[model samples]
Target chain A: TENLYFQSMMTTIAFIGFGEAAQSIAGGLGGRNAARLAAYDLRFNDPAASGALRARAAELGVEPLDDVAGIACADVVLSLVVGAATKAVAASAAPHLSDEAVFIDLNSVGPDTKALAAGAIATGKGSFVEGAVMARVPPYAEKVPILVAGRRAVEVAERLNALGMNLEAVGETPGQASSLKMIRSVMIKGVEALLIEALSSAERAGVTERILDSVQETFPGLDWRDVADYYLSRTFEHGARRVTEMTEAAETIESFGLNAPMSRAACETIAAAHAAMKDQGLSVNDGYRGFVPVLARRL
Target chain B: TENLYFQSMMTTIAFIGFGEAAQSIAGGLGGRNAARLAAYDLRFNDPAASGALRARAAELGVEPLDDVAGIACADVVLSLVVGAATKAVAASAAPHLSDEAVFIDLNSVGPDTKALAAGAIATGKGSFVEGAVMARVPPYAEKVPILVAGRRAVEVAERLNALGMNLEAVGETPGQASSLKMIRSVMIKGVEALLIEALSSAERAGVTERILDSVQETFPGLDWRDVADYYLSRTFEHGARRVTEMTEAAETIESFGLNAPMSRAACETIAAAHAAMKDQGLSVNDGYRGFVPVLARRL
Candidate 1:
């Protein structure tokens, strides 16, 4: 049933930036198909983290390399680096990539940066394909549907699909896929910020039951209790750390000179909540799965 | 299974404001357990709306009386009027009612207003029972859970329960139940208003899907798409009508002299969404159910 035209039966796919998502994608392939896989991450050499990420690579049948040269001849190269490192990952891989190789950038970044990543890939004589992973990668792994686009997007889609990927070709420009991802963060993060404010402040005000009723009446679909539980749990785990991510989101919005007040406020409120959590003396060892009971006692 | 101490077996219940909720409650009772129900509202005599109200009364088996004095001998009175008229209704009903009748006040008003309402009802020697309808009226109807309080609420609670109501005695304080509702609206309405801004704006900006991902990532508890759908649908349908409710919510926050910026914003946003619907040339005949197809074309 293979499409012989794709020549995917003999393809070598390499990933740049090995992370949880990268490992998951490799695990998803289960080491079959024409998909021979290799990976390189800046964290590959982290003495402390190397053992775990390295063991993951060995378990997934992924060749863990320290340098970009090992992936030069790869037919398809996926840039899976962080937002700030997308351009750097593209540049580093660009010089070493083979001519006309398919370079798919899947980082969450703005369109302007998407263009830069595309430019770097194009300069390397690599076909610049952009991808937006529209959801989480855990269970879906490589099969997690992605909106992939750009030059020869269809051909790349077929080739990647041949490699056991879920790539839907959506547009011909890099900006289309990346911009969709960027703008969406505005909404997703904005709601969280508002929720954190409403619930946390509600807890402080001693009216959780009262507001719970009103919310049930007004927005019947949402379980206010469970929503607050997840929100505060997230705030306890990642609230402080996400201040920087929210800042990045702010920068993404302001790059267009659009009003970024809500996101900015989201950043502010989350920062305050994290600071509040810190002041309450939560530690790394105890409260990963343990915030609700603690906050329940306080609220 | 019934509490006989309150003489709930032989009860005549009167509603001060025979609106949808009160009618639903009466309908829920079905005039059983030797219960008699009567109601008086200014609308029952309205030149235009009276026919519909009366027809509803006929259907619910309620005595839609011409005057409040018809219920002078009623054992229990329910004050289901608008928040602004809570005290006025008490003042008017108190004069003709028996001193032993229990007047349960259920409205979204501040603690101070609740105290005033309680004072008015108590002054007439009628037992004042503070009540907070914890949810919407339709699905829950008479079985809707309520936070009931005050000196004689236990007896009223026993009677109401015997007549098929879910009344939880929360406190003996008059302001406790009402203030819970007031404080909660500030949060509930505040979040709704924020959703209105985020979603309608997200649709305009073309990043709804992208944000859906981020929201799911950040707050996995929320089903973001459904939340937006609810907010926008309500905005298009009930947006114009709920303007007053949000304003009342704002007033609740403002009455506390606390900085009510969020509630104030919620009020402003709801007003604007309503006014925007008005500017679109909708008549009084239009509502949310009739809105989807019409707005679907533009949106």
Candidate 2:
């Protein structure tokens, strides 16, 4: 559909909200047809956005829209607003979309929120495609994996793949893509939470190195060097986000009739450490440099 | 002691009541001085003992004494009365023994009953040794292991060992020998009780062989072959004795706050089989042989 849309006379793609993830997805989709891609940003309302938007647009060879009217003529609307702002953008785009245009919601929102956004697109007589990005996009670029689930998933996936995005049709249900992402997060985040708590305890007991060596002996099949490096780096560089992931793990654990007090406690502990570093005007890299030295002095 | 007593002069060794176990111990002891060993069966005064006592001592070279005065000049008084009559025989022997003679109370009675027999021996000036035979006498003859405990244990053990007996001084307490025998019986008898209950239940469920195989797999390192043969033979040949042993095991388990209802049930089950075997006017050999076949059919 995207190839046909491109070869035919009138085919235009619109991106709403310009964030790192949104910009990466747009760049992968636009390619050499970058001139035909139109992206709208609320930053255009601010005087500072004019110069920055112009420079970014010039770099990608694409036109930037300051108002929803600029994308009202688009053949496809891509909603890439962050978190909870996705529903509001979906409502705004719903009023502006053409009757046959497809609205692709590619946000990281909960299932119910995504369903509400899907309903808004349905009100515009436009097909809604639920697309969930599975990994970080900067490195993967055009090959970034996306799972799509909706009534017209096959058509939407075909169109997205033709635009150089690795999109696969997952299921027919509108929320299935988001559900897969959420369930997969439980296992991935659970392991992260376990590592955080286990390593923190080892650090507190003044046996971090010994515990790492013991773990290497116990789980001889695992690559101890990689695991130890990953956990230690997470403690310094991504401690704050790790805390939030631990809370997510705690919620998943509680849903299974098990105790999650350790994970919940780890979340608060890591969050407290992150907040303290922030109060001292330290970046994550700076915090990483001082972590072992600070912990040694405190102990 | 047997050789020393024989060389010194004619040393009379008197057995109070002749039974199978008493005859085995007496025969083993008398091998050194058979002419000096005298066994008294009280059945000459009471005919009912003729069946149990007379038949038990039939093959042994022992002269039945008609009166307590017959053993008045005895040098060593060995009480071989049934467990229930142990204290009474101790009382009767107390008056007949010489002041220099040794009184050995060897009985299969509970610790408290053995203590009562010890008190009776204390009344006389005679030396008393509490001796417990630890195994069936048939296999070991004069070498059957005996544990002796009392003030005179060392002297009595030396004397007993000199008569080709395997005797050891356990402790100086009157009940110590009995305690060791009884406690060890608890574990041995507990195993017997457990196997009988488990195998009988399997037989009733029609999966005896499968259950045995599965159990062997579950406890792979266990000596299943020896356990199966020993347990099966006891459950068949001596079901009545097994019932008594299981009852003892139940008492031991109950002492530790554990419910041994299964062991108690096994006792009742085996007791019923023994009664059925006896009701058929069967010989001892017939009763023993029919045990397994009867249980196999009924179960």
Candidate 3:
């Protein structure tokens, strides 16, 4: 009965920029609750990018739009653009949003960036809310863990939940959700960088196994070898994206009037690794040891 | 029967420095097998520092030595000085060492410093063996996990193991054992410093609990709250000594032609923390939270 009610409400959902996260989510929603799902990606403006991206968006049960103005009719506008373009997209979309529209910005960004986007959304009828994906998107798609915040966070969460989304309202203001995500990344991403730096240095010294064994003994509950392999492989595989995220983490830490040495180092190290991996065309298929040679090489 | 053979040998043990580690090991040995035990601390050269230090040495079953020469008579000499003083003390004591004396360096230092000290000891009839105390000494005392490496590492392990000490012969080169210890500290102490920087940044953002809860969710196997508390408190308690150890770790990593960003950052952060903690006379008695306000303070 509840599902029927949500389906009958005829909510119009629009994605300001359709990418992997937006496609995954739209695929899961399947236009079951929303009366119409429309998306406009900047990639659609490029002759080369438009054809493939438009096909992908439409295949995900979303109506492809040529311009930002086409999403003006949506009751809910989700800004799923890249981190650097978040505020600009919010500003451009806010002017076209319908009255009482709820605009949720879901981008891996710092708190200050979220605040700036919120300010841009506030320039029009749309109510801005922040969304932070707490985990990866593929396995859970729209059901992936997300934290939302803002004045209308609870209302936005309720509306999104009705569409089969898993979003918890964690705070009542902009930057709150994004702040938690960034701070959490301080440890999550920082550990990845630390392991890379420490273990590779150990490898250079010909004591990698001894160091790993010693760490395992210190933190007896954790399988340090497996942890190292997973972290190293995953990091090498996604170093480019992770470098951006850690950079956002560093910015967030700095915004709080605190020094972010570890976060900054994480960003620096990850960036260095990504450049190296890209330059060498390295693949993570051989497991962690495959990257050991590259990591042990001189900077 | 093996213990009877060790007792019958009547070995003489001399400590070139008497600090917490020296006192703990000497107290645990209790002169049970050694015919004589003596220690000389540079502090004994000072009028105010010598009296109490000399008394403590005597109470720990170690005779107080008037000069470095007094320890030259011993069959085995242990160097338990600070990291900065390790090489210099080795040179000063090397010239006076008895013929065929086994000189064990048990200071927390880098592999290069251990190698340099080994060179100094090579100038005499004495044999140099590098010793690294893998854990804190108080609770474990002479039974602490100690890794030794040198040409005489195996022989030194046998001599010390017979006297109720736990020593493992890890390599037949001077730097091997110390390198392991230094590289290991790159993670152990590095984690400590990272936690202080991370959680304190979380606190400044007013999401310490949320960040902790999020981390717990991500790593369900570990209790991040307890970990944060334990690590932060212990770091605050021992930041001073940890700074030097991490500095040595940084040097060791750099020696291998690797940039020590995380290790250097750990050293920097821990040194900053120690200076602040000392300046304010903060105690870790109230757990991790007690140090948050100071950690969250501006530099």
Candidate 4:
């Protein structure tokens, strides 16, 4: 029952998306548990361009693979692609993974999409787990908390946590983890969309001081300026990605037989912000202050 | 030099609608240096109805007039009608108002509507004023923060503030005060709508505790519970009124060539919430807790 070498079997983890998640996580898990990392991204196959993605992968101690087949034997596979394309990546990676491999989806998609990935990864032999990244995976890297949900979640989560990952077992059903993220994005990013619509309009209206006064009266503990700066900075800086996440959040809600009017509007608001900023040639910086001047010109 | 009996000249204040606004302000100014108030509503003509409206009018110490002619002598005519009938009240009141009268419209209509009301009130005799309520009136009553703007706002503002009223001169135009209120409501009630959508869905899902976690994490200084309580209580209790305010907020934004998709959605969300509560035979109560369980069942 106490097989000492059982956990060591998960020594290799492959990243299907070799972008931010792959880089940060590889750095976090590379030294511990002797886990060899491999990754495959389309960015690595850009023949006409410089091998920047590959070089970055190498720098992060990740083995750069030209295709999915190189990580065919991975004991754990992480699909950390864009929320919308998460299912497609799972479809692509599922065909190559062995039976011992557990496909962990870390996308911010809805339960249905996670279900799609689960179906693709099944093959009647392998298991699929949902790893809903609760927050941004920086500063904490592998330690950024993730809720894990699947029938095999406990077995997979224990192995992942051995490599310093923070994993909370949420439920046996795979959708529970992804559902939490989808539902959460509605509030977190929904408000992000609201702040963009509100403060930008406030900046334009000249009643910003008065409005902030009301916001303060409603929330006496909040430093309105700091709250503005943080939300504005976070939203404007990530407008493009937030836009996509909001779009998927709407889709996620629609999957549950409910209308996603709020998420749909949040998507439009963020997309408009994204487009307007790009058209105005504005670059995002630290906090909301960096965004206000740029947004003031066009908003 | 002002005479000691100057306050008596401003004693007569007339109300166009015997609604909550009329009763609240009449009571607020009841003991303030002596003021004779008259209100005219179509309800006063309904002799077939029980005398409840008249009874409340008497309780509030306001004289009820079946026709507008009685209030014609009033120096100030407050058009506290519904937003749709604001201009109509101005048109009706305009023909009878004295040159010394200042027609103060405290309706939540668009700037265009204010201009129409101002045009109607300008028989070239009297001045028209806009009194935009900045917040709900209750314990504050006459002290409810109101912004006044018009060509003759200073005259009305000085006289009204002398009676312990809270009124700020926003601009020299009729729409300015209403425009500020319109704009401010977008954020205040817009966030109101967003919380309803966000938190309600979060409640529907099993992840509300998780959402409040993220919202709190993002806003560390904010008490998510209190924010939820305040906004949910505000929205659920006055869902009907909030819906109307958000609808006007959309119009305010649209006047500036802006598309208020989120604010528009907030309106629908609140309307649905209000309708659902009514259909479910539910009535709102004192706090967020009072409405949560009932709303949770439907939202």
Candidate No. with top DockQ: 3
| DockQ preference between candidates 3 and 4, better one | 3
lDDT of 4 by residue, B52-143 (tens): 88888888888888898776778888888887898778888888888888889888777778889999988647789988887777667888
Q: Write the per-residue lDDT of candidate 4 for residues A1-299, one digit (tens) a residue.
A: 22345555647888888777668878888666358888888877887532777777767788887887876868888888886787678778877888877889988777887888899888545679988887787677888888888988888777877767788877787887777777777877776776676666555555556666767776677687777766666666677888777887777666765567888988888777666666454454555555654554565
Residue B206 error, candidate 2, Å? 44
Candidate 3 on B23-115: residue-level lDDT in tens?
A: 888888875734578888888888989888878877777888888888678888999988789888888888888777889999877887888
In model 2, residue pairs whose N, Cα or C atoms come closer than 3 Å (at least 3 residues apart or on different chains), thus clashing, are none
| DockQ sort, best first | 3, 4, 1, 2
Tell me the TM-score of model 3: 0.86
Weakest 10 consecutive residues of candidate 1 chain A by summed lDDT: A287-296
lDDT for residue B199 in candidate 1, whole number 0-100: 46
lDDT at position B77, candidate 2:
69
Q: After superposition, how far is residue A161 of candidate 3 from its true place, in Å?
A: 1.3
Over the full model, what C-alpha lDDT does candidate 2 score relative to the true structure?
Answer: 0.61
lDDT tens string, model 2, B96-158?
A: 777777777787775567778878877876667787777787777667888777887877676
The stretch of ten residues in a row with the least summed lDDT in candidate 2 chain A is: A185-194
Clashing pairs in 4: A229-A288
Q: Could you estimate the TM-score for every candidate?
A: 0.61, 0.43, 0.86, 0.80
For each of the candidates, the C-alpha root-mean-square deviation to the true structure, in angstroms, is: 7.9, 20.1, 3.8, 4.9
How many times do residue backbones clash in model 1?
A: 3
Q: What is the TM-score of chain B alone in each candidate?
A: 0.74, 0.69, 0.78, 0.76
Superior by lDDT: candidate 2 or candidate 3: 3
Per candidate, native contacts kept equal: 0.20, 0.00, 0.57, 0.39
